[PDB]
Amino acid sequence: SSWWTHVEMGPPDPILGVTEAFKRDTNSKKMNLGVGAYRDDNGKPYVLPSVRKAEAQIAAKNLDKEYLPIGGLAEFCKASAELALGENNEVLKSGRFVTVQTISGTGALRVGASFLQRFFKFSRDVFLPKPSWGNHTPIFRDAGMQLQGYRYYDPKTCGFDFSGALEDISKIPEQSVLLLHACAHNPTGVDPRPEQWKEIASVVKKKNLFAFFDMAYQGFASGDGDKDAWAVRHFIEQGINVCLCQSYAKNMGLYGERVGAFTVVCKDAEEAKRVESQLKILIRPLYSNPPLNGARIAATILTSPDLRKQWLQEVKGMADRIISMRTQLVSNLKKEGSSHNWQHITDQIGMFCFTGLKPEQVERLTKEFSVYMTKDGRISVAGVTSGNVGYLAHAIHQVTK
Amino acid sequence: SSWWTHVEMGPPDPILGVTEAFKRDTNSKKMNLGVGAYRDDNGKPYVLPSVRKAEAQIAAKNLDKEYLPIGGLAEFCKASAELALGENNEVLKSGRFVTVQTISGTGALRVGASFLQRFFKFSRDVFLPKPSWGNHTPIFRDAGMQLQGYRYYDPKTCGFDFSGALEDISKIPEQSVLLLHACAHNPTGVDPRPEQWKEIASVVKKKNLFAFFDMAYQGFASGDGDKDAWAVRHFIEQGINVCLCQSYAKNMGLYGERVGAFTVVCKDAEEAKRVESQLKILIRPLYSNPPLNGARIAATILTSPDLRKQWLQEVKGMADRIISMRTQLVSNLKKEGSSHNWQHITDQIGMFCFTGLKPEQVERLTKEFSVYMTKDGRISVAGVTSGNVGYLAHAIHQVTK
């Protein structure tokens, strides 16, 4: 026998399957709407020009490759809090926060979760929206927390079920943890409006809930970094000491370089030093310390007012191409004669959209049309191009007419 | 009235204390023997030329920054296994193994610990040498395992307590996990000679123990990749399906790029698939996927027969320099006429060295001599240079005459 005779084959990764089925398809019309990363108008990976600039300008300094501190590159950390909280945020001025570099936004979720596990004595329950990023569940579980949920997605309108959310949130046991997507909710693309965000905050504050924000799309979401981070900022301003996860995968296109941060906002700088030392104690035994490249690229962009300003324009480009595809898809559905309401497609934010398609319809799109998407009807808008958007709208109309 | 009021400040980092005491030291004969990375003869970081070269071919290639698969970059993984086992190994030829890319050697250790915790149903117990790398303890603890020790260092001889190790390993409950440093034990520098490894291997095989190899210094240790990974290879050859953490922090000076691998040797190719699915399921909720840049570097080096030969030479150069500092620090101690035996300094391997020094002679070495090193008598041979070896020889004689 053997050590691992009893280790079972894991279940198939659904998203990868869709992707591999797409690659094997000879149909010349086929489309990949399961890709989980930005594509430009010809369906190609897109390394931002500002990232290329920063990179050339880094190779020029003949930098070493030594270990960073456990919390990573100090200037990346500080810039990254500024990115999120904004320039003169009182949190920044009073120093009442700590930020650590992590292994993209997944590492920040994991680091944050492990910190809740050890120090958040008030609860073991993390409430996730229905639905949420599929990884959220295994990260908190493996970290040693428990998952619950709150009503978010409205299947009846393909929008925000505000009344359900607010009812659920206002019943969460006091001092539980609430997880909130800061904007561009993955997988649905559905976000509360400023006005609704306000009332969630007021409940969170009133019931004394701990707020945990996942922010993987600042700037990429709408092209506007300040709008996108508005809810995190507002919770902080109603005096809610959030913690926060940032990713630079999508808004700088650094996907495989793994650049993100985790930030806890505290009562004062003293409490932040304490959380900091304990954050470092949790990081050292996961990976000792974080990687150099992507944090240098990112630090260089954020601290150089020209590169920064150039980077923001590139981000607006990306958000705009996405918004354009949403708008086009919709108007093409009108052109094709569909009588269904499609406005969700444009109210939603970011690169993911719940189309509203049922599983049987998804099978038709794939079999009859070679449109590839997950069975929950989520499309990756990044796979839509001005070149394929007419075909798409025809296929969607066909299977729903 | 705050979430974290009860979160305590962490203990101080002994080493840092020491590093930063050094930098305050104002005498200019001062030495930092507590530095955890390779330094060259002028005490400076060292990017290897083959690394600069590889980086260059890569920048020329103009590649994207898209996500790696959960397992990481295939060619780096395949090349990584070949480094460790030697190509032409029966393991690689039958495909009975899985190698995944991880966040350097720490991440490999944490990933394998999590694997153990979840699928090693025979035991919670993980046996570390006395002493082992400091981070081994919290890595295994946070992952959910228990720690034991077995005798390894022998303060009477500053060598390997062979017969203690054997007696201890013999009394390990069957089907426990045994962690073995592959070459260049850290912190002592003490290794078993081959014939002694032969004897640990046949006990491990007789008492049905699971052999967990931590190999952070292949090549770096002695300057011969094959001699360094001999012990690992011998275990496998004897029928022990070990698992294995690789680091490239020290042998390619990729410290902050975080390039590592975790390899489980298996009974056959089928088992390796099953073990692979589950490693994927474990990695995904820690950090999703691993960083690109260092893996790209290492695969470029390892797959070009030209760069690979060149890199091995520079590796051989690092190992010889360290060896050279050891031999001269022994030479000089005899020429200062000390009467204590110091064969241990040249018998030891790699860049850490247990001197024999008691904590009082270490204090004297700081106060009276500006030689900084930890209280346990560990020196980093890398902070020793041909400029300062004479001084250190002298100082060490002064405190031990």
Side-chain angles (χ1 to χ4, degrees), chain B residues 31-44:
Chain B
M31 298 164 73
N32 185 18
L33 302 193
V35 80
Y38 190 75
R39 284 295 175 277
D40 76 4
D41 216 82
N42 300 120
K44 282 242 179 312

Side-chain angles (χ1 to χ4, degrees), chain B residues 106-141:
Chain B
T106 305
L109 285 156
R110 174 63 167 261
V111 160
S114 60
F115 190 68
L116 290 172
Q117 187 278 345
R118 167 168 300 176
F119 299 101
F120 198 79
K121 48 171 187 179
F122 322 91
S123 179
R124 298 291 68 185
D125 279 322
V126 171
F127 284 79
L128 311 180
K130 285 196 252 228
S132 199
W133 190 40
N135 209 20
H136 279 152
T137 298
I139 287 166
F140 281 101
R141 188 106 90 217

Side-chain angles (χ1 to χ4, degrees), chain A residues 264-304:
Chain A
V264 177
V265 167
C266 321
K267 178 202 200 174
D268 53 39
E270 196 276 304
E271 162 167 300
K273 297 148 197 322
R274 290 193 272 109
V275 170
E276 183 183 9
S277 72
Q278 302 289 336
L279 242 19
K280 281 159 58 179
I281 290 165
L282 279 158
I283 300 177
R284 196 163 145 68
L286 285 145
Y287 54 86
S288 266
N289 63 80
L292 259 183
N293 229 53
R296 272 165 171 170
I297 298 168
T300 305
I301 294 181
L302 306 157
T303 50
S304 140

Side-chain angles (χ1 to χ4, degrees), chain B residues 207-390:
Chain B
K207 281 210 121 213
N208 197 43
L209 309 180
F210 184 81
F212 198 96
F213 275 103
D214 182 9
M215 172 165 65
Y217 304 97
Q218 185 183 13
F220 189 87
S222 85
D224 183 353
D226 296 295
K227 172 168 87 66
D228 285 357
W230 186 84
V232 171
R233 300 189 187 147
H234 180 73
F235 278 53
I236 294 182
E237 181 208 271
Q238 292 308 292
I240 304 174
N241 289 323
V242 302
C243 75
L244 167 64
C245 301
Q246 281 173 291
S247 175
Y248 295 80
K250 304 105 170 169
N251 61 8
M252 280 187 182
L254 294 179
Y255 304 92
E257 296 303 339
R258 316 306 294 124
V259 187
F262 178 71
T263 296
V264 175
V265 175
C266 302
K267 190 211 191 308
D268 68 15
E270 203 278 340
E271 181 170 276
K273 286 217 313 269
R274 290 186 278 106
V275 171
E276 189 193 351
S277 55
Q278 298 293 332
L279 282 174
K280 285 144 73 161
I281 286 171
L282 247 357
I283 283 146
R284 185 157 163 75
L286 283 157
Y287 55 78
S288 284
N289 45 63
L292 251 183
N293 184 39
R296 273 165 175 179
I297 286 150
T300 325
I301 301 184
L302 299 162
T303 49
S304 154
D306 278 358
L307 294 158
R308 183 178 171 92
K309 175 193 299 287
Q310 171 192 352
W311 160 64
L312 286 183
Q313 291 149 195
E314 335 193 304
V315 147
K316 186 159 183 319
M318 278 181 291
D320 298 339
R321 182 181 107 61
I322 289 298
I323 297 187
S324 190
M325 295 303 103
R326 288 168 175 288
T327 79
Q328 294 178 40
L329 167 66
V330 178
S331 223
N332 288 183
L333 269 162
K334 206 149 309 181
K335 266 141 29 79
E336 278 264 347
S338 222
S339 33
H340 304 131
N341 189 357
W342 304 94
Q343 251 275 28
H344 60 274
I345 310 209
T346 42
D347 280 341
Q348 293 167 7
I349 290 158
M351 82 169 162
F352 300 106
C353 167
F354 254 29
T355 55
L357 295 176
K358 321 256 308 302
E360 302 72 35
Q361 302 166 332
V362 165
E363 244 155 30
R364 288 187 65 197
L365 273 181
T366 302
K367 262 107 137 191
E368 306 165 17
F369 284 99
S370 280
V371 170
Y372 292 87
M373 58 155 95
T374 50
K375 298 294 195 227
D376 67 357
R378 202 200 46 162
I379 78 172
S380 150
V381 181
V384 172
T385 72
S386 48
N388 70 3
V389 69

